[PDB]
Structure formats: structure tokens, C-alpha cells
Amino acid sequence: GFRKMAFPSGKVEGCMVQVTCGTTTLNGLWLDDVVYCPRHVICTSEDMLNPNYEDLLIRKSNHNFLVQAGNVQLRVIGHSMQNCVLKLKVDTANPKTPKYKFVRIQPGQTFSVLACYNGSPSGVYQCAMRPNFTIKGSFLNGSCGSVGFNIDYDCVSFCYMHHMELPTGVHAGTDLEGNFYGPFVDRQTAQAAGTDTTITVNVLAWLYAAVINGDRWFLNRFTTTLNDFNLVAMKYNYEPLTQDHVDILGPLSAQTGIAVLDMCASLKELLQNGMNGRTILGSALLEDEFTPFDVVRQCS
Amino acid sequence: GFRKMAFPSGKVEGCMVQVTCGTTTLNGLWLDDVVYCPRHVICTSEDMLNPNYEDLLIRKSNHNFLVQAGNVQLRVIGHSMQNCVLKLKVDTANPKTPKYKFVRIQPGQTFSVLACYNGSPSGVYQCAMRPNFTIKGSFLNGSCGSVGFNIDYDCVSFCYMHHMELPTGVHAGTDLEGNFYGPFVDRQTAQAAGTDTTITVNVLAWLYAAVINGDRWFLNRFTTTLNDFNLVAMKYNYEPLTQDHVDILGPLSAQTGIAVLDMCASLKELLQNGMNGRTILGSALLEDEFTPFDVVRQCS
Ligand SMILES: [Cl-]
Ligand SMILES: [Cl-]
């Protein structure tokens, strides 16, 4: 009774366009009279290993950028590079521009991804910005410039633009000012994300979700302390739990009558002893891609 | 690198309205000049245990059905009950009606759910119509009349309308002609779904997806026969695999160079021996809610 849920994507579908430079085609985000897209649209297959973006860009004029919205060709009247994204000024404002903002999201927070190909929406799914600043997406060639977002009432907060795949099949991108999340660079090399630490607060949130939905086998008669919990968390590459994490979990704790440190005691045994074949909300692993706010919103 | 993915929901968002009868409010689907909704919108909290729908309906006139689309009130000019859904004729065609069809989906197939409350889209997620004709959704009070759908190019095939929750937290509903999937009835009793059998063909599909994405530890040097595989499948309440299942898996088999019966040999050992702590595409359980077509579409 508890699902990984993405926001409705209608307001973002109307912002997706196709951007082509030469033989390279990817997606752009069309808001007011600007199309945002990854700068590596100007790269050929040769250039992607060590691109000199400033030098490659100087070779490109407005008319080299083919921007298409359905059957309609948009007229490019200006271009500039801001960090790792290109801003293509077009001579038409997008009539479907929603209320929007750009935000740089924190590690541990979630957002929906509208995977796109050739400017056309393909599918929607929920991601978390991991502590090592990667995401576990589903992206193929041609998906760059797909965006991640949250919706707040009727306002769309864009937080992610897709640029690349990392060694382990995880994904890296930028905010809409073109700065990467994490230490990554838009070049076709193997780059390391460090240790993939687990978002402890999100695991606790999800264990509360499990209690709300009738899954309680993992509750025990014990409690712990923050410092003693974190001694175990560390060994398992879990993020240290802080008092502010504890306060953020207040509402779920209160709704369930399970003190946060009692739930930590249960988590401690799950980490040391495992699940011995049992499941929690239909998973045999501890899920860390629901925030406290995500649990509250879905369970109300 | 492989995610549970829902279709983009924009075309369905524009079809959702609020329907209220008395103190009961749920969602309706507004296509052309008709609003489809669950008939139990005419029930009070008392009536929901053993409703006599024909008798309750005879007490209701057009003006008792409050249909609202955003700030705009729709004028109800006719109503009729078709099986478990009500059809409310309104005096305005929905300008946002997409190309659409109604389809009764087969067990084992998947679709996206646009969960809605008060006629407002809340979130989107992918479901499968299970063999016991339930789904594993995420639905609260007020979510009835939320729909499930597939998109084929620009045509929306509506296949599910939400009506109720079953003992184990799973969900039951109807097609858009108002016939339940499965043996369920729209009355507030505890009703059984039988044994929840696993969609074998979908598990195989997903194991192929795992190979495509570099997860191959579970491959072995063995093969099996259809009849010998099914002797093991049965004990685990897996669906019997048929030759037509084998042919549907052809393209994935061919793309990976793993004969379907070789993959069955691998599945056989996973069922008998378990996963011994290992994971497959980030799950410690065998996933059966991807069809062969879903894997092909996402991996291309
Ligand atoms: Cl006890
Ligand atoms: Cl070997």
C-alpha cells in the first residue's frame, strides 16, 4: 500500500523541445524565450573524450542550433554558455511555460524525472539525490537534457538536468545553472563517485511508512542512543543521524507512537542481523529514497 | 539502470474532475460530454456495507451530482448506471479530451495509475494487473475514480478505474464499462483474492533486463525443459510458462544470446536456493511487474 510515486508530469511535458547541433540531438527545456540544454550538444563523437568547450562553441553560430517543438521550428536569436549548460534565446516565448523556479537540491532530497528522447516525453519516475551526488536513473543515448523537478502547488521547481552515466550505471547531472551536483565533469572519461552512503533519515522514514501500513514484525522491545546508533550506522556506510533528523521525523514518530530512538533500535538489528527472508513494504532491502515529507504526503 | 517507469500523465491530467454526491466526494473521468465515476459516490457511510444501488440511485436526480473541473461547475443533464460505474452526461464537451479508447486489460499486463484526490492529480506510478485480478497500488480515501491507462503514440487506452481496497492492502477496480476485474463487488465487506500467483513471463523478462544492464551473477551452465521448469514453478505459485510466453521472450533472448530455457534454469535455482544476500537490479526479490514489452521499450 505504499509506492514509489512521481509527480504528475503534465506541466513539464509542455516545456520539452528537441535540440540538434550537427549529428548530435538531445533535449532542451523551453521556458519563456530561453531553451536550456547540456553544452555537450556541440560535441561530435570525437570531441566527447576531452572537449575544449570554449573553443568548440566559438565555432558555432545561432543558426547551427536546430530547436524544434513538435512540428514547429524555433528561431535561435542568441546563445551563451553558463557553466555546463547552454542558453539558446529564441524569438518566441513558450505559451505553456508554467510558474517555475530553479533550485539546487540538497543531498538526501527527492524529485521526479521526466525521461525524454528527441524532445518527446518517454516516462516518469522518482529519484533521490544521493549523498555521493549521483542518482539511480534510467537513461539512454539521447536522454540528456531530460529534467528533474518537484511540484509545489502549481509551481514547478526544476532541480536537475541530465548529462552523463558513471561507472556503476548511476547518473550525474547539473542544476539549471549548469553546475554539476558532485565532483563530476562533462567529459567521456570514467570518473569515480565515492562511497554510496545510505540516507539514514530516509530509511527511518520508510520504516515508519511500513508501520503506518501494517508491517511491524521488525519492531522490538529495545531503544538506543544517537551516539550508539551511529557507531553501528558508520560500519554500514550509513549517514550519521543528527538531532535535526530526529526533529524532522517528529510527525511520523508522533503519528505512530514510536519514538525515533526506538525505531533506531529496530534499524540497528536489521543492519546487524539482516531480514532473514522477510520483507518490508514488499522489499527485501532497506529503502532510502523516501524523505519524511514524501511519506507524510503519500500517507495523507 | 532500470526503473519502474510510468507513462507521462499530461493527457490524462486534463480529464480529471471532482464528483460529489451529498457528503461523498471522489474523482471522475471527463471525456467528450460524459463523466465516468464509481457508482458508490451515491452511498453514505451507512449504505456502503450492503448497498442496493438501483434503489439508492432512483433517489438521485441530475442536480444531486456536483461535478467540478477546477473552478468551473459542470451542468449535469443526464445520468445512468452501467454495471459499477455511473455515466453523467454534462452539457459541455471536455476541450482537453485526448484520442482515447477503453480496453479491458489481461492479467499479467501493466499500466500507469494517476492517483487523484478531489479531482486533482496527486502522483503517478506503474502497476500490473495481477493474476488474481488485484493491483498493488497506493490509494487513500477520496482516490476512487482515479484511472489507469497506457499511451500508444498519442492515443490513451483507459483500462482501470479504482474502487476499493482488499484485505491484504491490495486494490480492486473496474474497466471503464464498470465491470470489476476479478470476482470482487463494490460493497464494504472483506472479500478474498485467491492465491497471488507470480507472473513467470514477467520475471524472466526482468532477468533479461538484468543481463542487459550488466547483472549476470545468476546465470549458470544449465538448461531445462518447459515441463520440468513448470514442476518447480507450481510449487512456488508461479504461473505455468507456455510456448507463447517463450515466443514473446524471443527478442530479449535474441538480444542477449540467452535461450529462454537457459534463463529458466537460472530462475529454477533462484527459486529453490534463493538469492543468498545478492541483488538483481537493486532488488532482493524477484520482480514480476515488468512485461517483455516494458523491458524492450525501456532498454531502447
Ligand atoms: Cl513479545
Ligand atoms: Cl565457471
UniProtKB/Swiss-Prot annotation, chains A, B:
Residues in the Cytoplasmic compartment per record: 1-300
Specify the taxonomic lineage: Viruses, Riboviria, Orthornavirae, Pisuviricota, Pisoniviricetes
Tell which residues of the whole protein are contained here.
3265 to 3564 of 7096
Q: Where in the cell is it found?
A: Host cytoplasm; Host Golgi apparatus; Host nucleus
Effect in UniProt of substituting K89R = In strain: Beta/B.1.351
Catalysed reaction(s) here are: TSAVLQ-|-SGFRK-NH2 and SGVTFQ-|-GKFKK the two peptides corresponding to the two self-cleavage sites of the SARS 3C-like proteinase are the two most reactive peptide substrates. The enzyme exhibits a strong preference for substrates containing Gln at P1 position and Leu at P2 position
Instruction: Write down what this protein is called.
Output: 3C-like proteinase nsp5
Q: Where is this cross-link: Glycyl lysine isopeptide (Lys-Gly) (interchain with G-Cter in ubiquitin)?
A: K4, K89
Q: How is its activity regulated?
A: Inhibited by pyridone-containing alpha-ketoamides compounds 13a and 13b. In turn, alpha-ketoamide 13b (tert-butyl (1-((S)-1-(((S)-4-(benzylamino)-3,4-dioxo-1-((S)-2-oxopyrrolidin-3-yl)butan-2-yl)amino)-3-cyclopropyl-1-oxopropan-2-yl)-2-oxo-1,2-dihydropyridin-3-yl)carbamate) inhibits SARS-CoV-2 replication in human lung cells. Inhibited ex vivo by michael acceptor inhibitor N3. Inhibited ex vivo by compound 11a and 11b.
Instruction: Cite the record's note on assembly.
Output: 3CL-PRO exists as monomer and homodimer. Only the homodimer shows catalytic activity. Interacts with host FBXO22; this interaction promotes the proteasomal degradation of nsp5.
Please tell me, according to the UniProt entry, what happens when changing C144A. Complete loss of 3C-like proteinase nsp5 cleavage
